[PDB]
Amino acid sequence: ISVRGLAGVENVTELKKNFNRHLHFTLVKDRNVATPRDYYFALAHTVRDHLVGRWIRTQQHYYEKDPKRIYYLSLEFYMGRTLQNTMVNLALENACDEATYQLGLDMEELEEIEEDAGLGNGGLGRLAACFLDSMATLGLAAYGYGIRYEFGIFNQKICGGWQMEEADDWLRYGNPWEKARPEFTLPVHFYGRVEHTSQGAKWVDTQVVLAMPYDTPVPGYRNNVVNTMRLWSAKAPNDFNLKDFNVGGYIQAVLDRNLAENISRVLYPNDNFFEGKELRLKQEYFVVAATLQDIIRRFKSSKFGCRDPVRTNFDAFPDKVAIQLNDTHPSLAIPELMRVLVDLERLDWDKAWEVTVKTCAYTNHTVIPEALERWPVHLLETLLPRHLQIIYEINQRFLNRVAAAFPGDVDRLRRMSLVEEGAVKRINMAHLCIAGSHAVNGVARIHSEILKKTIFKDFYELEPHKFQNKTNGITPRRWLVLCNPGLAEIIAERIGEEYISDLDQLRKLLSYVDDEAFIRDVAKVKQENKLKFAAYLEREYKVHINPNSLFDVQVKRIHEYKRQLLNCLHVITLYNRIKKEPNKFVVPRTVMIGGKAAPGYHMAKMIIKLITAIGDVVNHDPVVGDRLRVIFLENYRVSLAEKVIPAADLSEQISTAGTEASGTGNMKFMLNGALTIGTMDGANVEMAEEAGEENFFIFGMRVEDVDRLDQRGYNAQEYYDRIPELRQIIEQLSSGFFSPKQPDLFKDIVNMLMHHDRFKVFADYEEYVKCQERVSALYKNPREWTRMVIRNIATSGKFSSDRTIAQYAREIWGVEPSRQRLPAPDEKIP
């Protein structure tokens, strides 16, 4: 059937009775009333049963051996569905497929019922999920720590061409994967004040919110390692949240509990944009405060909570603990770790600081200013009084270091401060992270260099040793084996199965680049994938596409820097050329654009309306026929990504050079048989460098050209003046060609493009359509297109998150990865 494992005789039988056990005992139903949803839960519980045995022994193991623990703090974990992925990593897919078949059910149909765990916005949240899978696969004693939001990223609905947001109640029917652990509930403090008494400061008169943990298993790939992802839930204490007496109402007091619990209710839907709301800041401290207590508790036990030197010496803390900051969101971990060590454990400042800097590491994800976390001091002052005091003290000592290193450089002092003066004083969280971490890293080589040359130049000059680079990557398991079994199978037919946990081996496919059978096969799976997607489209969304056309897709969050607008300009150009010479042949294309816009991002929502507007015109023009279709992929999410990427021919990674830190969707497309048209931005550079620029469609300005243009001054009018095709499009938008009933509907877009384009869209237009012509030319030659595809796939190995993690492990965390199978799952009950 494929290498989805063995469909053993004993195990298919075992699976079936357990499926029935759960349907009866767990779901309390009987075959005559069970619905596809009940069937999905019976299977889910059956699959979950197979990894609890391994989960327990993996955790017990770490307790016995006591290795260095890796804590990955992130406010986002974009997990997606977990049924299939678990089957894959446990080599249970074929057996389950067989068993459910014999039970007379379609597994694929049941998989579609599982709700996505959308606890993320985009890149940052998905990176964290890929990292978790890789860390488990490399046998690291790693824990994912975050917030269990009851409402993840909103579900997007397109009404009248506009985006409509609606609550993502992903827990409505329950989550069979998580395991509530009320018994490990911890208290977290807010507000209050600071008392300076005799021997130390005291954080007093605080409001308490409880943090209840929920554990979700993270199985490695076929090695029997099952790590833990612990998500915190907010819970109100029963006392003061009732006991602070003297009139108010008993009923009201109970109803008001949903005020402390609102902390974990919803994820902020902002991608690469900072919103200084109090609720956000509370979420950030909540995950940090709770997580640290858990970290120290585990440390206090270790082998020190037995003997060792005997005296809670936190000198070994950094040797046993490593906490990674996914961006600046969990940055309060730095002052919080100090608060505990100094205030509670009573270590002297300097010893505490040494421990802190040595166990923390920060990962930066973007260079755009509006994405930078700068919290107003009045907010920190009110909510976390003691932490503000600690930050000021950290700032005081750090600046003194700078003054001593650069005597008389007074501007450098204000530039590097963690405290920013002005309208309102703010705390620069990124500066806090650099100072309290022993390693700071970019997510792609060019991004890492830009940090050193630009944004954090002063910091780099101060401590050059801190700055590193760790190019992102994706997990080959979910992003290849799981979403594209067809491609995975043909690859395995030639080079084996070891590449799933050793992607570098894909290089061996280079020697089949002229193989006639392989070329035919690679081309065949892509065709089958396109056919399956085209079908899904009519199935779930309804209104036909042509599977023979080139599948041009751009899927990612809607941003001005991602330039979905530049994609739009090309689409309109194609249309206009067809309308000019109707009876001329052009390569057919289905351009698919999908993504979510943050609710308050007006421009982004205006762009979604433009895309659908273009589609309304283009898709109903009889002269165009089936040569050009414009489709807006609704509710883009992980599960939707697993469907479109395998069916894509052209991947669009066209951000303005220097704005996309790395990107990961790009890598997803490369490994799945799509060719890339993009700019020399983020990881695109390392991808073209790995595949050879000849096998990539690079166009536009490089970083240097962008900067030259800024010195000069960017004037969009010039481009409008010298390019008639560009002019024609802008006047079409301005006159209502795309919005008849509301002719001035797109005035904001035109106004912006002509007068305040921060991402110089017009500047890359000419080179962009010229380059698009080149891809169309190559698509006309199937054999050569496929051969170039083989060159990309065979060369994408460097982009596996296993490689990224192995580097973090060795160069930051100080641990050694291991592909050693944990001693089976085998029963056992001590």
Ligand X SMILES: *Cc1c(COP(=O)(O)O)cnc(C)c1O
| Residues tagged in the binding site annotation for AMP | 30, 63, 297-306
Query: 329, 557, 589, 605: which one is catalytic?
Result: 557
How does DSSP assign 153-184, residue by residue?
A: SPEEEEETTEEEEE---TTTT--TT-EE-GGG
Query: Which long-range CB contacts under 8 A does 23-28 form with residues at least 24 apart?
Result: none
Nearer to ligand D6G, 66 or 515 (CB): 66
Active site residue 16: no
122 touches ligand X (CB under 6 A): yes
Structural contact between residues 660 and 706, judged by C-beta atoms closer than 8 angstroms: no
Binding-site string for ligand D6G from residue 125 to residue 164, where x marks contact by CB under 6 A and - marks none: ----------------------------------------
Cβ–Cβ contacts within 10 Å for residue 103, how many? 17
Q: Which of 637, 760, 791, 803 binds ligand X (CB under 6 A)?
A: 637
Active site residue 524: no
The site that binds ligand D6G (CB under 6 A) totals a number of residues, namely 9
H-only helix segments in 665-810: 665-671, 684-691, 703-712, 716-722, 724-735, 747-755, 761-779, 782-793, 801-808
Closest contact distance (angstroms) between CB of 134 and ligand X is 15
Query: 86, 664, 676, 804: which one is catalytic?
Result: 664
Query: 69, 426, 668, 760: which one is catalytic?
Result: 668
Residues 367-396 that bind ligand D6G (CB under 6 A): none
Q: Which of 99, 434, 638, 775 binds ligand X (CB under 6 A)?
A: 638
- Cα separation of 290 and 262, whole Å? 16
424 binds, among a copy of itself, ligand X, ligand D6G, none (CB under 5 to 8 A by kind): none
Binding-site string for ligand D6G from residue 212 to residue 251, where x marks contact by CB under 6 A and - marks none: ---x------------x-----------------------
Query: From the centroid of its chain, how far is CA 655?
Result: 18
- 487 exposed, middle or buried (CB, 10 Å; 0-12, 13-18, 19+)? buried
34 binds, among ligand D6G, ligand X, a copy of itself, none (CB under 5 to 8 A by kind): none
6 binds, among ligand X, a copy of itself, ligand D6G, none (CB under 5 to 8 A by kind): none
Structural contact between residues 465 and 473, judged by C-beta atoms closer than 8 angstroms: no
56 touches ligand D6G (CB under 6 A): yes
Nearer to a copy of itself, 245 or 585 (CB): 245
Stretch that binds ligand X, among 16-24, 242-250, 635-643, 723-731 (CB under 6 A): 635-643
Nearest to 788 by CA among 650, 681, 664: 650
Active site residue 557: yes
Query: From the centroid of its chain, how far is CA 571?
Result: 28
Nearer to a copy of itself, 173 or 191 (CB): 173
The pair of three-digit structure tokens given for residue 561, joined into one six-digit string? 């820097």
126 touches ligand X (CB under 6 A): yes
Stretch that binds ligand X, among 104-112, 160-168, 340-348, 636-644 (CB under 6 A): 636-644
Residue nearest to ligand X (CB): 665
- Cα separation of 637 and 641, whole Å? 6
Query: From the centroid of its chain, how far is CA 518?
Result: 33
Residue with tokens 């992925």: 85
CA angle 85, 86, 92 (to 5 degrees): 110
The site that binds ligand X (CB under 6 A) totals a number of residues, namely 12
641 touches ligand X (CB under 6 A): yes
Q: Which of 28, 251, 423, 829 binds ligand D6G (CB under 6 A)?
A: 28
Q: Which of 9, 10, 33, 543 binds ligand D6G (CB under 6 A)?
A: 33
Residues 650-709 that bind ligand X (CB under 6 A): 663-665, 668
Binding-site string for ligand D6G from residue 170 to residue 199, where x marks contact by CB under 6 A and - marks none: ---------x-x------------------
- 827 exposed, middle or buried (CB, 10 Å; 0-12, 13-18, 19+)? exposed
Nearer to ligand D6G, 55 or 467 (CB): 55
Longest dimension (CA), the chain: 90
Nearer to ligand X, 591 or 613 (CB): 591
When computed from its CA atoms, the radius of gyration of the chain, rounded to whole angstroms, is 28
- Cα separation of 416 and 402, whole Å? 9
Active site residue 605: no
Closest contact distance (angstroms) between CB of 765 and ligand D6G is 54
Nearest to 566 by CA among 757, 352, 717: 757
Q: Which of 3, 24, 53, 59 binds ligand D6G (CB under 6 A)?
A: 59
Q: Which of 556, 589, 605, 760 binds ligand X (CB under 6 A)?
A: 556
Query: 54, 556, 609, 629: which one is catalytic?
Result: 556
Closest contact distance (angstroms) between CB of 260 and ligand D6G is 24
829 touches ligand D6G (CB under 6 A): no
361 membership: H or E segment, kind and range: strand 360-363
List the beta strands (DSSP E) in 222-296.
226-235
238 binds, among a copy of itself, ligand X, ligand D6G, none (CB under 5 to 8 A by kind): a copy of itself
Active site residue 358: no
- 829 exposed, middle or buried (CB, 10 Å; 0-12, 13-18, 19+)? exposed
390 membership: H or E segment, kind and range: helix 385-405
Nearer to ligand D6G, 132 or 753 (CB): 132
Binding-site string for ligand D6G from residue 789 to residue 828, where x marks contact by CB under 6 A and - marks none: ----------------------------------------
Query: Which long-range CB contacts under 8 A does 10-17 form with residues at least 24 apart?
Result: 11/95, 12/95, 12/98, 12/99, 12/102, 15/46, 15/95, 15/96, 15/99, 16/99, 16/102, 16/103
228 binds, among ligand D6G, a copy of itself, ligand X, none (CB under 5 to 8 A by kind): ligand D6G
Q: Three-class SS of residue 439?
A: coil
39 touches ligand D6G (CB under 6 A): no
Active site residue 590: no
Cβ–Cβ contacts within 10 Å for residue 251, how many? 8
Spatial neighbors of 227 by CB under 8 A, at least 6 apart, are 58, 132, 135, 136, 140, 141, 142, 143, 144, 217, 218, 219, 220
Closest contact distance (angstroms) between CB of 259 and a copy of itself is 9
Cβ–Cβ contacts within 10 Å for residue 490, how many? 18
Closest contact distance (angstroms) between CB of 118 and a copy of itself is 14
123 binds, among ligand X, a copy of itself, ligand D6G, none (CB under 5 to 8 A by kind): ligand X
Stretch that binds ligand X, among 457-465, 630-638, 794-802, 809-817 (CB under 6 A): 630-638
250 binds, among a copy of itself, ligand D6G, ligand X, none (CB under 5 to 8 A by kind): a copy of itself
* Binding site residues, ligand X, CB under 6 A: 122-123, 126, 556, 636-638, 641, 663-665, 668
* Binding site residues, ligand D6G, CB under 6 A: 28, 33, 55-56, 59, 179, 181, 215, 228
Catalytic annotation, residues: 365, 556-557, 562, 664, 668
